[PDB]
């Protein structure tokens, strides 16, 4: 009580939503989940190694790629250890442990340690340094005190009921406003098990029906996770409002009695359509009034084919995740249940062949899951696992076997999928789920995962009404186990970004170009420096870096329609070898969640390419959405837009020219050596992004949204946005670097083409994994009333089904479409 109340307030501020609030609930599920997440929290806290926890070595067991091997001769890497003033340099082999070479080796500039029983080759920092052509540097330091990571102390059976399910629609009530009807769907996954409508009435501000809607499905046939989905159409109709209610609640009980549900408006696959959350805006939202009536009813717990058929089944099984199953296929999968079970890849389809509205079939399915010996022993396929976690699956036991598989992921692989795994919580029927606990116990076991877990959850709590409650309960559970140092750390991070938000927002209210504002910005910054800015905060998109003093001199504001703040900070770590500022852009008016998702997919593309010894030098800069249309972005040093390079050597904004970009590169390359290093990095980076963006359907890019660094690294930006078209941006100037003009070939255009194809085929070897991630991004991140149309773009993009010849040839057509078109799309912007 004495501490519990100030502590829960610490938690409310950190979360930015009161988890102990019952203003907007009709049951106690949220609270039940708070209580329920205590066990797995306490287990993970109990079993975590204090030493490795506090230092969080960021390691991988991946093989050191072929391209990074070729950046070391005679098998000897150099690590320069720092005493105080002087620094000695030790020669080592990739295999050497940090033991091998009271103290602990910490990275200079960063809270990042080279510790534990892993070879230096396998540390991500060492792998990072090797990549960029940088040398490894560490300070002999005391291991940080584990003490600092201390944690504060803390019926009638359903299957004996043959009645048909029914629900009364008393009426709807809207304070401020055609005819209208209520449709009531019993859903499972996306599957509509059974549907009923009311008679149409006139759409007045209050509409009463008093009718029983009788469903064809029996109570015993209600599956756990079935949503009563209530929707309101008007009229050739149009969906105006929706709400959902779980028919079987957290305790397995059948949901009974009176409900006044506040509904959501509409602006069609969308995670938002699935939430059990009610609209909290009661004074405006549309309400529906229902009665579920029947004593409490509880769901129990569940204590050699023909050649052409097998082949027909092997075809079905092999098809892609977005390939529709006909009933004919469903019937075949289910009849051959046990054959289908021998193939982990058949699982998604197989469990999409189950009649979830039929209780004996569901029991047979669970008997099937009891026997998943092959599943259990198979190699982890994340593509296949993620499929089982999407909106097509609402059965806990099905979904649980996906999570079961995610357990074998090393901490490096979690980070790779964390955002998308945080987003897949939107598909869980219930607040407490095996997926939320996986996230939780994995966040609690590794500070790096823990860090981003916080921010990914906070991103959603701050802007999703459809899921802030759930995600909030989950984040609290993390916060109650992360440890005092992280709490304090988070408190610092939140305070800063809330101060910087103010200034960004306040300046945007004082607004295409600025005069009096440039010192009105610097006024407010100077204020915070000594008003309440902490001397150091952690960089949310890069937790290894603490930022400190503001470089007011360097801070500016874009001459844009959204006045983002360009901010710079001195690094708080005295032992940083450089004094490069830390560069954060703060922006309002774009939805940076969409950016988070594209940047993360890009990172996944890189690690795929890594497994085929392909580096394409992408630049997935950091980006965290922190609130309602607001967030932060990593400033990439020594970087300029392609647009501004054109507007400098050509000047006027009308025309364009080819030489300028190669000319700008030579000017930024001191020696010829580094100029050729750039044209190479440019061919790769151009390749990486041409492939990356064609697949994701975002290649047609205004070229003030493509940037290049002074070492020739091309990189796309500002993905939150999205006259004839172009599959991607490969403009005459890009081609001029590659020594080509109109129609020609060169030792670099042949390489670029070469690379693009390898890059492209390497993505297709993960057709499914990409199809699911893309599928999920759109549903959870791009509320664009996403259709089958939109999702099925990536299939065509990855030319599914085609052999590698036709695929190779397809992409080279695209390369040429761009050649043929030149400046047409770019010039067409200004009109
Ligand atoms: C468009 C460009 N974008 C980025 N620049 C650097 N790092 C980044 N990371 C993601 N986007 C950028 C940019 C953004 C700005 C935002 C605020 C501001 F005050 C100034 C900005 N300036 C640039 C910019 C434009 C042309 C050349 C260099 N920087």
């Amino acid at each position: 009580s004495e501490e519990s109340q100030a502590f829960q307030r610490q938690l409310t501020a950190l979360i930015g939503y009161d988890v102990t609030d019952v203003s907007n609930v009709h049951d106690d599920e949220l609270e039940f989940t708070r209580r329920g997440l205590v066990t797995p929290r306490m287990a993970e806290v109990a079993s975590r190694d204090p030493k490795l926890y506090a230092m969080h070595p960021w390691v991988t067991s991946k093989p050191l790629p072929e391209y990074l091997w070729k950046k070391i001769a005679n098998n000897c890497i150099f690590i320069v250890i720092h005493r105080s003033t002087t620094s000695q340099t030790i020669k080592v082999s990739p295999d050497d442990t940090p033991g091998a070479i009271d103290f602990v080796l910490r990275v200079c500039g960063r809270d990042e340690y080279l510790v534990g029983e892993t070879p230096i080759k396998n540390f991500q920092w060492v792998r990072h340094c090797l990549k960029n052509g940088e040398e490894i540097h560490v300070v002999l330091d005391t291991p940080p005190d584990p003490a600092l990571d201390e944690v504060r102390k803390e019926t009638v059976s359903l299957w004996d009921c043959d009645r048909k399910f029914r629900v009364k629609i008393r009426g709807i009530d809207i304070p401020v406003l055609l005819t209208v009807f209520v449709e009531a769907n019993i859903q499972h996954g996306q599957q509509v098990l059974c549907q009923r409508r009311t008679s149409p009435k006139p759409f007045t501000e209050e509409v009463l029906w008093n009718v029983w809607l009788e469903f064809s499905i029996k109570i015993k046939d209600l599956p756990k996770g079935a949503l009563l989905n209530l929707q309101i159409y008007c009229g050739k109709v149009q969906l105006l409002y929706y709400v959902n209610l779980l028919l079987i609640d957290h305790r397995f009980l059948l949901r009974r009695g009176e409900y006044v549900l506040h509904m959501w408006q509409i602006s069609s696959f969308n995670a938002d359509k699935l939430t059990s959350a009610t609209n909290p805006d009661k004074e405006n939202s549309m309400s529906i009034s229902i009665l579920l009536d029947n004593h409490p009813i509880a769901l129990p717990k569940h204590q050699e084919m023909p050649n052409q058929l097998r082949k027909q089944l092997e075809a079905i099984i092999a098809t892609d995740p977005l390939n529709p199953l006909t009933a004919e296929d469903k019937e075949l999968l289910w009849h051959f249940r046990y054959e289908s079970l021998k193939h982990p890849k058949a699982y998604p389809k197989l469990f999409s062949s189950v009649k979830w509205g039929q209780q004996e079939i569901v029991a047979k399915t669970y008997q099937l899951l009891a026997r998943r010996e092959v599943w259990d022993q198979s190699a982890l396929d994340v593509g296949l696992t993620m499929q089982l976690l999407d909106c097509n699956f609402s059965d806990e036991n099905v979904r649980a076997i996906a999570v079961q598989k995610l357990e074998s992921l090393e901490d490096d692989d979690v980070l790779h999928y964390l955002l998308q795994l945080v987003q897949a919580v939107k598909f869980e029927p219930y607040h407490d789920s095996a997926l939320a606990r996986f996230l939780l116990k994995r966040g609690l076991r590794n500070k790096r995962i823990g860090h981003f877990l916080f921010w990914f959850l906070r991103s959603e709590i701050a802007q999703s009404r459809h899921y802030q409650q759930r995600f909030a309960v989950i984040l609290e559970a993390y916060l109650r186990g992360c440890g005092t140092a992280m709490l304090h750390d988070f408190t610092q991070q939140v305070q800063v970004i809330e101060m910087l938000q103010k200034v960004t927002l306040d300046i945007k209210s004082l607004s295409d170009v600025s005069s009096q504002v440039i010192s009105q910005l610097k006024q407010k910054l100077e204020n915070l420096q000594n008003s309440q800015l902490p001397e150091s905060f952690r960089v949310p998109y890069d937790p290894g870096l603490k930022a400190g003093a503001l470089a007011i001199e360097k801070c500016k504001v874009m001459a844009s329609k959204k006045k983002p703040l360009w901010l710079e900070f001195k690094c708080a770590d005295p032992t940083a070898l450089s004094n490069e500022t830390i560069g954060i852009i703060f922006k309002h008016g774009d939805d940076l969640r969409q950016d988070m998702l594209i940047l993360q997919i890009l990172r996944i593309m890189e690690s795929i390419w890594e497994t085929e010894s392909l580096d394409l030098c992408l630049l997935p800069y950091g980006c965290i959405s922190t609130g309602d249309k607001i967030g932060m972005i990593e400033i990439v040093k020594d970087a300029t837009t392609i647009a501004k390079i054109q507007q400098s050597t050509v000047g006027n904004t009308g025309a364009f020219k080819d030489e300028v970009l190669n000319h700008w590169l030579k000017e930024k390359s001191p020696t010829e050596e580094k100029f050729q290093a750039a044209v190479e990095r440019f061919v790769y980076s151009c390749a990486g992004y041409c492939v990356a963006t064609f697949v994701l359907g975002i290649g047609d890019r205004h070229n003030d949204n493509i940037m290049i660094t002074e070492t020739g690294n091309l990189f796309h930006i500002d993905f939150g946005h999205i006259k004839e078209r172009v599959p991607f941006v490969l403009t005459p100037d890009f081609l001029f670097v590659m020594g080509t003009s109109g129609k020609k070939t060169s030792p670099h255009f042949q390489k670029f083409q070469d690379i693009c194809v390898k890059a492209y085929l390497a993505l297709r070897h993960h057709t499914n994994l990409l199809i699911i991630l893309f599928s999920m991004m759109l549903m959870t991140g791009m509320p664009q009333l996403t259709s089958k149309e939109d999702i099925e773009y990536i299939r065509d993009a990855l030319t599914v089904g085609k052999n590698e010849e036709d695929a190779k040839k397809y992409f080279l057509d695209q390369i040429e479409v761009c050649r043929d078109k030149g400046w047409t799309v770019q010039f067409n912007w200004f009109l």
Side-chain angles (χ1 to χ4, degrees), residues 1-84 86-90 92-831:
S1 304
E2 298 264 341
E3 290 181 4
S4 282
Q5 281 139 211
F7 173 63
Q8 184 66 54
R9 286 173 197 188
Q10 197 202 128
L11 293 182
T12 289
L14 284 170
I15 297 167
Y17 183 96
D18 196 342
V19 165
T20 74
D21 188 278
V22 289
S23 77
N24 188 36
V25 287
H26 51 260
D27 62 55
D28 74 321
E29 193 188 359
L30 292 169
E31 191 61 33
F32 194 92
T33 305
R34 297 186 63 207
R35 283 189 276 163
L37 302 154
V38 177
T39 305
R41 153 154 28 111
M42 302 242 236
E44 194 50 50
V45 171
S47 74
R48 78 178 161 213
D49 174 35
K51 207 79 181 166
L52 286 167
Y53 186 56
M55 293 183 295
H56 60 97
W58 177 12
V59 297
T60 184
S61 286
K62 282 197 164 190
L64 192 50
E66 285 190 69
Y67 54 82
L68 289 189
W69 273 114
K70 280 149 186 157
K71 271 161 197 178
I72 175 168
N74 294 334
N75 199 49
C76 167
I77 68 94
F78 282 81
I79 299 213
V80 182
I81 299 185
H82 288 260
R83 176 168 166 183
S84 286
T86 60
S87 61
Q88 197 59 285
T89 309
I90 299 176
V92 224
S93 102
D95 285 10
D96 286 24
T97 165
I101 58 179
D102 274 323
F103 324 108
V104 70
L105 288 174
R106 167 173 91 76
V107 176
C108 292
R110 303 177 151 275
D111 296 350
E112 198 83 37
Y113 293 85
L114 300 180
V115 202
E117 326 312 329
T118 16
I120 39 99
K121 53 154 184 185
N122 284 12
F123 285 82
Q124 274 285 106
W125 190 248
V126 175
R127 293 199 174 190
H128 166 262
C129 291
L130 287 161
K131 197 181 208 255
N132 304 2
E134 291 168 38
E135 33 183 69
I136 303 142
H137 281 277
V138 38
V139 60
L140 186 69
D141 209 353
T142 303
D145 196 354
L148 303 144
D149 292 319
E150 179 188 60
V151 187
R152 180 199 188 286
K153 298 182 177 190
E154 321 210 56
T155 44
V156 153
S157 169
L158 203 89
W159 301 342
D160 298 320
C161 193
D162 283 337
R163 298 190 68 180
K164 277 165 192 162
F165 176 81
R166 68 180 194 152
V167 50
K168 172 171 274 184
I169 304 289
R170 303 198 160 286
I172 54 180
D173 197 307
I174 181 65
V176 188
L177 163 151
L178 299 191
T179 63
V180 160
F181 68 89
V182 159
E183 168 179 283
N185 293 307
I186 305 297
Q187 277 180 31
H188 192 265
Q190 298 286 122
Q191 193 168 309
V192 171
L193 295 179
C194 220
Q195 168 171 117
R196 286 291 179 285
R197 275 97 168 283
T198 64
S199 49
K201 297 271 199 167
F203 185 27
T204 71
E205 282 147 307
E206 182 226 4
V207 195
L208 302 178
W209 267 282
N210 197 11
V211 293
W212 289 102
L213 293 175
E214 203 184 342
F215 288 93
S216 48
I217 185 170
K218 304 179 175 181
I219 270 53
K220 60 183 197 174
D221 293 324
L222 293 175
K224 198 191 181 198
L227 288 169
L228 173 64
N229 170 252
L230 302 160
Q231 301 188 311
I232 287 175
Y233 293 85
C234 77
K236 308 172 172 183
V237 306
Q238 216 127 49
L239 188 41
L240 280 163
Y241 312 88
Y242 68 88
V243 65
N244 298 307
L245 180 60
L246 288 163
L247 292 158
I248 306 210
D249 75 341
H250 40 288
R251 304 190 159 79
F252 298 80
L253 294 168
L254 179 65
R255 191 158 261 108
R256 199 162 55 81
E258 288 283 10
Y259 294 86
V260 174
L261 305 173
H262 286 281
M263 303 158 78
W264 306 104
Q265 207 183 312
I266 306 287
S267 258
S268 179
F269 289 105
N270 194 316
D272 284 341
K273 280 217 83 300
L274 297 160
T275 183
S276 65
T278 59
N279 191 329
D281 184 359
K282 297 202 178 191
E283 182 138 319
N284 302 15
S285 68
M286 165 77 82
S287 175
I288 188 169
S289 300
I290 72 177
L291 171 55
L292 312 174
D293 187 353
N294 267 303
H295 303 272
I297 306 173
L299 187 74
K301 281 83 180 179
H302 309 61
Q303 186 187 342
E304 307 302 61
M305 61 189 300
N307 184 36
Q308 209 76 273
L309 294 195
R310 167 162 290 109
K311 303 287 183 158
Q312 178 178 1
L313 188 66
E314 266 154 44
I316 292 152
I317 287 176
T319 69
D320 58 84
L322 289 184
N323 182 72
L325 294 160
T326 66
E328 286 73 39
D329 295 326
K330 285 180 181 180
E331 290 203 44
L332 191 86
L333 283 160
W334 177 257
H335 184 54
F336 296 112
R337 220 133 80 239
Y338 289 107
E339 180 57 33
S340 303
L341 206 68
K342 294 171 188 168
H343 293 283
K345 278 167 183 215
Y347 280 47
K349 277 128 155 72
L350 175 40
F351 294 118
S352 305
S353 311
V354 172
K355 290 169 181 176
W356 293 101
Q358 193 164 341
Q359 177 281 329
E360 302 194 358
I361 294 304
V362 174
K364 282 189 196 149
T365 305
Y366 290 10
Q367 286 303 326
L368 205 57
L369 298 172
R371 198 163 264 179
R372 81 258 208 282
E373 302 177 290
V374 170
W375 181 257
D376 288 357
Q377 279 149 17
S378 77
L380 180 55
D381 181 333
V382 183
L384 172 57
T385 314
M386 295 279 167
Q387 318 194 15
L388 298 173
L389 291 177
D390 82 9
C391 57
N392 296 286
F393 303 95
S394 321
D395 183 281
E396 296 180 335
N397 306 305
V398 174
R399 296 182 66 91
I401 72 156
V403 181
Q404 206 257 129
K405 279 277 141 162
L406 299 177
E407 301 286 15
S408 56
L409 285 163
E410 66 190 327
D411 291 298
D412 187 38
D413 283 320
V414 176
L415 288 168
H416 283 77
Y417 301 106
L418 187 60
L419 176 46
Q420 225 91 13
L421 288 178
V422 167
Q423 295 295 308
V425 176
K426 298 184 175 170
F427 309 123
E428 283 291 340
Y430 295 94
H431 302 314
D432 194 4
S433 75
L435 180 66
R437 302 184 173 198
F438 170 77
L439 295 178
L440 178 58
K441 103 183 155 104
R442 293 307 294 266
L444 288 171
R445 188 188 299 162
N446 170 295
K447 287 195 158 187
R448 199 179 166 78
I449 290 168
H451 171 75
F452 290 98
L453 178 48
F454 174 88
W455 284 107
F456 294 164
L457 290 168
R458 199 183 206 280
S459 176
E460 297 285 351
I461 292 148
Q463 34 192 324
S464 173
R465 286 87 59 243
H466 299 71
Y467 298 96
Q468 62 199 152
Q469 291 167 306
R470 173 177 285 177
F471 283 127
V473 168
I474 295 159
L475 173 58
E476 181 213 26
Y478 170 66
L479 284 168
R480 285 166 176 279
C482 48
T484 316
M486 301 228 65
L487 289 171
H488 164 90
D489 216 316
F490 287 126
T491 298
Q492 246 188 353
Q493 302 183 38
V494 177
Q495 282 173 346
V496 165
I497 93 92
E498 281 188 4
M499 291 165 183
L500 298 162
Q501 189 218 25
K502 286 172 183 136
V503 191
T504 314
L505 295 175
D506 290 25
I507 281 178
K508 207 177 163 169
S509 320
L510 264 160
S511 331
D512 267 288
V513 209
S514 53
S515 160
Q516 302 182 1
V517 173
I518 275 180
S519 288
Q520 254 281 25
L521 166 51
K522 292 173 180 177
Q523 201 83 324
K524 295 184 200 170
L525 290 177
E526 283 177 9
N527 277 117
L528 286 177
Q529 200 82 293
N530 42 46
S531 292
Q532 219 171 239
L533 189 72
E535 275 76 333
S536 64
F537 67 99
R538 250 188 231 292
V539 184
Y541 62 79
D542 187 2
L545 265 169
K546 280 201 286 137
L550 260 173
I552 300 89
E553 330 79 55
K554 287 145 157 173
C555 295
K556 65 192 169 187
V557 164
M558 194 165 189
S560 153
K561 305 237 169 192
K562 298 163 193 162
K563 340 291 155 160
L565 302 189
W566 177 291
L567 303 175
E568 284 177 31
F569 294 91
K570 277 168 184 173
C571 182
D573 201 310
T575 76
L577 305 323
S578 204
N579 38 96
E580 299 297 285
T581 58
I582 301 179
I584 316 203
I585 283 162
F586 257 88
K587 182 182 207 155
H588 172 268
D590 286 351
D591 190 350
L592 297 181
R593 286 179 296 169
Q594 292 168 141
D595 291 62
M596 294 196 293
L597 288 166
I598 302 290
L599 284 153
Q600 198 50 240
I601 282 180
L602 290 186
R603 286 189 192 92
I604 286 159
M605 282 168 179
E606 293 228 278
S607 49
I608 285 151
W609 288 331
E610 180 172 333
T611 73
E612 302 189 12
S613 307
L614 267 165
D615 184 336
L616 285 80
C617 329
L618 297 189
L619 222 154
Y621 51 85
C623 178
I624 306 295
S625 198
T626 45
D628 197 357
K629 317 275 167 191
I630 219 165
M632 83 212 320
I633 306 172
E634 184 184 346
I635 288 177
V636 174
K637 292 283 181 175
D638 305 320
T640 198
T641 52
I642 294 305
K644 190 174 176 180
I645 291 172
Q646 287 280 306
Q647 297 159 219
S648 73
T649 322
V650 156
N652 70 118
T653 42
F656 292 106
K657 203 147 195 170
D658 316 346
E659 209 224 74
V660 179
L661 189 43
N662 199 57
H663 206 234
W664 182 86
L665 271 168
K666 181 51 172 180
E667 285 171 337
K668 299 301 185 162
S669 306
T671 86
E672 186 80 4
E673 195 88 49
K674 293 155 166 176
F675 171 63
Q676 292 299 298
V679 183
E680 186 176 25
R681 184 160 274 265
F682 183 84
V683 160
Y684 284 96
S685 278
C686 191
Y689 284 96
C690 286
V691 176
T693 66
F694 175 64
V695 176
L696 300 169
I698 60 175
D700 197 338
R701 298 292 283 171
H702 13 60
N703 75 11
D704 48 302
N705 293 312
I706 298 175
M707 296 206 74
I708 184 164
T709 60
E710 293 187 5
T711 50
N713 201 134
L714 197 73
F715 70 102
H716 287 217
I717 64 159
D718 300 354
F719 303 103
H721 290 224
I722 44 168
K723 300 189 166 179
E724 25 67 4
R725 317 163 256 166
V726 67
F728 45 86
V729 181
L730 177 89
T731 36
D733 52 317
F734 291 12
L735 297 156
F736 186 82
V737 172
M738 305 185 196
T740 319
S741 153
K743 62 174 211 163
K744 289 200 168 198
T745 71
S746 318
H748 285 147
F749 180 69
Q750 290 163 350
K751 190 147 92 194
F752 169 77
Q753 280 170 313
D754 167 303
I755 289 161
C756 284
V757 187
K758 298 194 186 311
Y760 180 50
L761 299 162
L763 291 186
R764 293 172 84 259
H765 304 148
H766 300 67
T767 289
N768 293 3
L769 161 50
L770 294 175
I771 285 176
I772 292 298
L773 298 178
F774 183 87
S775 162
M776 286 179 160
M777 173 181 67
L778 304 183
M779 289 191 284
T780 76
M782 273 108 173
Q784 61 191 114
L785 290 143
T786 51
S787 42
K788 278 139 199 150
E789 309 162 316
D790 285 322
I791 299 152
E792 286 170 8
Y793 166 93
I794 190 160
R795 298 176 72 192
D796 287 25
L798 284 158
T799 46
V800 178
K802 303 288 138 196
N803 78 130
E804 295 202 337
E805 292 187 357
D806 274 20
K808 168 199 169 197
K809 287 180 183 190
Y810 181 75
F811 201 84
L812 297 166
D813 283 330
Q814 304 314 316
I815 283 193
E816 284 298 318
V817 171
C818 303
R819 300 286 276 109
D820 191 43
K821 293 289 208 180
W823 291 116
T824 295
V825 159
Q826 299 287 354
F827 158 69
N828 277 38
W829 194 67
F830 307 97
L831 299 165

